[PDB]
């Protein structure tokens, strides 16, 4: 029997390369009346044209699998979706080549879609390994608010929760904004000096400019960016010493095409040695039924361990994403990028080059600055923490205990009355009690200073269900920690 596999490409030369690859492939393995040919088609601007053209291609012959590649252009995740939408109703597998977006990883949206390169939200393993290597324990996320960054943030959160060490803070800024300075001021000096950035190109440029205006790119900070914000116009403004990641062979599509041809050839040859098979339907106007060439083909395609080829070992996980990839940890020096290491998928082996950390110097900054200033929250109580309004000038009046000692006092900054609901004003009082002098002794022994302010809500804190949401958050004084 003769079975053919079609594809859509971006240039005529790629079509000739595909023809040569399939000609080389079919002249191997077995020849039990098996002959496969390649049918190609170029790209068109509008997506409905892609839909009609691809269903006409399906009409031409019973295509067992389709190869798709994103043309060289901006992200534009709308280019590959018409093929997946059209072929999904027939439930025929579709092979992707260069689309690295993480939206397609959802099983519900795309039931049949295979990827040959790891997605954008898949480099968090590299960051975790690098943190383990350089003994970094505190990080500050800066993920932008979009569907792309949610997967990365949740994967990193789960991976950190494996070790019972959560991220210090996660920030979110709206995409396509114009002034993000408030967030950077808020997160400039919390506890940590390791910034992990993942956003779009323009947002990355805005963040870079804002950070450069705040004098945060100086010595004592370590940047760890993804892949997108190292190429394009992101190099117009970028502090020296950023450590980005790059795919080893993300542009040489010929090797990917050859490996895909080989793996699907092996899969179809293995599948054809069975019983109870049918063919996908011919014509995008005649039949409206699910092709029986369905989940069995995908299941046998997933378990297709390949020994050694032009890119390395090929193994598919239960996510439709290629595993065991190679990453090139690289550093930027004096507006010129250079290689610093290699990620083989197990660990990272340093090369014979010394990194240049931001702000100059070569000392591997510890990335943790301790702040000897704590904000301490207390609540009103009868025998523990009294509250007495201060006198007119501002300083508290003196008091004497029966045995004759000057009871120590500190100045609180809590709201008055019962709640700041109607009046949104806070008047400085000063509080003394049984816990305050213990805190004084702790501060004296501990060699730090303090600053105490009351709690606005006034409750001790319990887990309360959010308003029509599936997330549980704390409240009151318990929620201010």
């Amino acid at each position, epitope marked *: 029997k003769i079975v053919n596999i079609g594809a859509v490409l971006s240039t005529r030369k790629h079509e000739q390369m595909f023809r040569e690859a399939v000609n080389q492939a079919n002249k191997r393995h077995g020849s039990w009346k098996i002959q496969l040919q390649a049918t190609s088609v170029t790209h068109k601007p509008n997506a409905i044209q892609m839909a009609l053209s691809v269903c006409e291609d399906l009409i031409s012959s019973q295509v067992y699998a389709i190869l798709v590649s994103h043309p060289p252009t901006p992200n534009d995740h709308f280019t590959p979706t018409p093929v997946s939408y059209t072929a999904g109703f027939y439930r025929i597998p579709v092979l992707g080549l260069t689309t690295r977006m993480s939206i397609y990883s959802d099983k519900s949206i795309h039931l049949s879609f295979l990827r040959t390169v790891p997605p954008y939200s898949h480099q968090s393993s590299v960051w975790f390994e690098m943190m383990r290597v350089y003994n970094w324990n505190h990080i500050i996320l800066l993920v932008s608010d979009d569907h792309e960054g949610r997967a990365a943030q949740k994967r990193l959160e789960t991976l950190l929760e494996e070790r019972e060490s959560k991220a210090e803070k996660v920030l979110q800024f709206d995409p396509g904004t114009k002034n993000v300075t408030a967030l950077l001021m808020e997160a400039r000096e919390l506890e940590a000096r390791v910034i992990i950035l993942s956003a779009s190109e323009d947002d990355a440029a805005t963040v870079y400019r804002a950070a450069a205006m705040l004098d945060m790119t100086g010595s004592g900070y370590v940047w760890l960016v993804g892949e997108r914000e190292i190429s394009g116009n992101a190099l*117009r403004y970028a502090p020296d010493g950023i450590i980005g990641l790059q795919l080893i062979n993300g542009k040489n599509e010929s090797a990917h095409i050859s490996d895909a041809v080989g793996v699907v050839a092996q899969a179809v040859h293995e599948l054809l040695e069975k019983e109870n098979i049918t063919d996908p339907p011919r014509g995008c106007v005649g039949n409206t039924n699910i092709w029986k060439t369905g989940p069995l083909f995908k299941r046998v395609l997933m378990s297709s361990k390949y020994a050694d080829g032009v890119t390395g070992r090929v193994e598919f996980n239960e996510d439709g994403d290629r595993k065991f990839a190679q990453y090139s940890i690289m550093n930027l020096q004096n507006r010129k990028l250079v290689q610093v290491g290699i990620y083989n998928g197990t660990h990272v082996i340093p090369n014979d080059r010394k990194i240049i950390w931001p702000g100059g110097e070569t000392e591997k900054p510890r990335g943790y600055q301790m702040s000897t200033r704590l904000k301490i929250v207390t609540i009103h109580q009868e025998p523990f923490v009294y509250v007495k309004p201060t006198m007119s000038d501002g300083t508290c009046k003196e008091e004497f205990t029966v045995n004759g000692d000057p009871v120590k006092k500190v100045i609180c900054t809590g709201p008055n009355d019962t709640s700041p609901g109607s009046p949104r004003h806070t008047v400085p009082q000063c509080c003394y009690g049984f816990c305050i002098d213990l805190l004084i002794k702790l501060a004296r022994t501990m060699q730090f200073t303090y600053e105490v302010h009351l709690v606005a809500d006034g409750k001790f804190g319990t887990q309360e269900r959010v308003q029509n949401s599936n997330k549980k958050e704390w409240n009151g004084m318990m929620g201010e920690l």
Partner: antibody, heavy 115, light 108 residues
Framework: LQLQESGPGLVKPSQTLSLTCTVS?????????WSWVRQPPGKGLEWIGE???????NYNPSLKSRVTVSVDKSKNQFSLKLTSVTAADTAVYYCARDVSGGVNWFDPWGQGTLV | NFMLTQPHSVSESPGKTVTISCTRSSGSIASNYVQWYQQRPGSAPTTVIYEDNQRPSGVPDRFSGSIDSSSNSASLTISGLKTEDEADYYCQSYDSSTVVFGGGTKLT
């Protein structure tokens, strides 16, 4: 700050050149890179290499395995040891230092050699 | 890498405004920018403008520069021609792997 061009100077072919540049008014233990721009007579400019005081180097892909530039921390001087010099690459060699900043801003330029 | 071309055969009358252009052969000159170096005959080249907008600390304000982002060429404008104008002017850009120097230009 001032960069003073120096070096022995040779015109013989099929040898290895060795020129060293001294700096006055500044210290090489800084954050500024050091350039070695070469000037062919009657022509424009072409970049050669940069050296950081830490020790790492940055060369040109064309002449990758033919030019080596190193520095001497104790003597406060760097040098160029271009090897396998032919008779068709004679030129005048310039010593220049740029500012780190976020740009490449090679200035001020040195006196320049005449090899 | 790429190449740069400049009109090295431009020389107008004294007391006039002239514009010099450095063109980028390959790529789009919109992320990495260019600075101009002036070389007097018998000395070392000196910078006259960097960042394409701000002149160095101490220089006449007659010289100016701008870009079009359409023809992939950067234009440097000099006004009020005088005796202090006969010099070799060069443009230098850079991709993110090497450094690229222009052909150069001079006026009489």
């Amino acid at each position: 700050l001032q960069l003073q061009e120096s070096g022995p100077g040779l015109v013989k072919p099929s040898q290895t050149l060795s020129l060293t540049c001294t700096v006055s008014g500044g210290s090489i233990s800084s954050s500024n890179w050091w350039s070695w721009v070469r000037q062919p007579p009657g022509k424009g400019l072409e970049w050669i290499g940069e050296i950081y005081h830490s020790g790492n180097t940055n060369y040109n892909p064309s002449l990758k395995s033919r030019v080596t530039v190193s520095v001497d921390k104790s003597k406060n001087q760097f040098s160029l040891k271009l090897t396998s010099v032919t008779a068709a690459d004679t030129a005048v060699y310039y010593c220049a230092r740029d500012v780190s900043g976020g740009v490449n801003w090679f200035d001020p330029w040195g006196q320049g050699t005449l090899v | 890498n790429f190449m740069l071309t400049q009109p090295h055969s431009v020389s107008e009358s004294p007391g006039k405004t002239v514009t010099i252009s450095c063109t980028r052969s390959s790529g789009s000159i919109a992320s990495n920018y260019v600075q101009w170096y002036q070389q007097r005959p018998g000395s070392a080249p000196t910078t006259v403008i960097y960042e394409d907008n701000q002149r160095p600390s101490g220089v006449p304000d007659r010289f100016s520069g701008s870009i079009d982002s359409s023809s992939n060429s950067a234009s440097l404008t000099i006004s009020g021609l005088k005796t202090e104008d006969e010099a070799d002017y060069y443009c230098q850009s850079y991709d993110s792997s090497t450094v690229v120097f222009g052909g150069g230009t001079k006026l009489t």
